[PDB]
Nucleic acid binder design. Structure first.
Lengths: 58, 66
DNA sequence: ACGTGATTTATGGCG
DNA sequence: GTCGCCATAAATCAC
């Protein structure tokens, strides 16, 4: 259910390195899905959850 | 910092009726939109938006198979 | 119980 | 000037 240490590290590295625009494109989501060993919907869910939880935690 | 950094749940009954109409017809007629809205105490926009969300949920259901 | 991944309401942009 | 799809926000659900 919960993503591996590496998958979360990959997603967070992307998010914070792209903090100016943390909205990966379709292909960038696919690249992140292949690297993390998750689905594109799971990448979309992760980014959606990360964007809201980051802005509230300010 | 950046420009990007800047809802009511439905009752089990409302969801039951909305689901019933979708299971009968995936698309909502103008007349049904007014009949559903009055009977469920939801706006005409709310019923339309629900049908659109439910079609989009059905999309992800068929794609989930393969 | 908690937290995180998933789902439910709601919006606007676009074709 | 109508509609519906898609990505997304924010709240909420739930394994």
């Amino acid at each position: 259910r919960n993503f591996s240490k590496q998958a979360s590290e990959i997603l967070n590295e992307y998010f914070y390195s792209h903090l100016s625009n943390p909205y990966p494109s379709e292909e960038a989501k696919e690249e992140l899905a292949r690297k993390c060993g998750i689905t594109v919907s799971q990448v979309s869910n992760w980014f959606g959850n990360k964007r809201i939880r980051y802005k509230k935690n300010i | 910092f950046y420009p990007w950094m800047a809802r009511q749940t439905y009752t089990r009954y409302q969801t039951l009726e909305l689901e019933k109409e979708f299971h009968t017809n995936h698309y909502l007629t103008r007349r049904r939109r007014i009949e559903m809205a009055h009977a469920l105490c939801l706006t005409e926009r709310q019923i339309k938006i629900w049908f659109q969300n439910r079609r989009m949920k059905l999309k992800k259901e068929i794609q989930a198979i393969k």
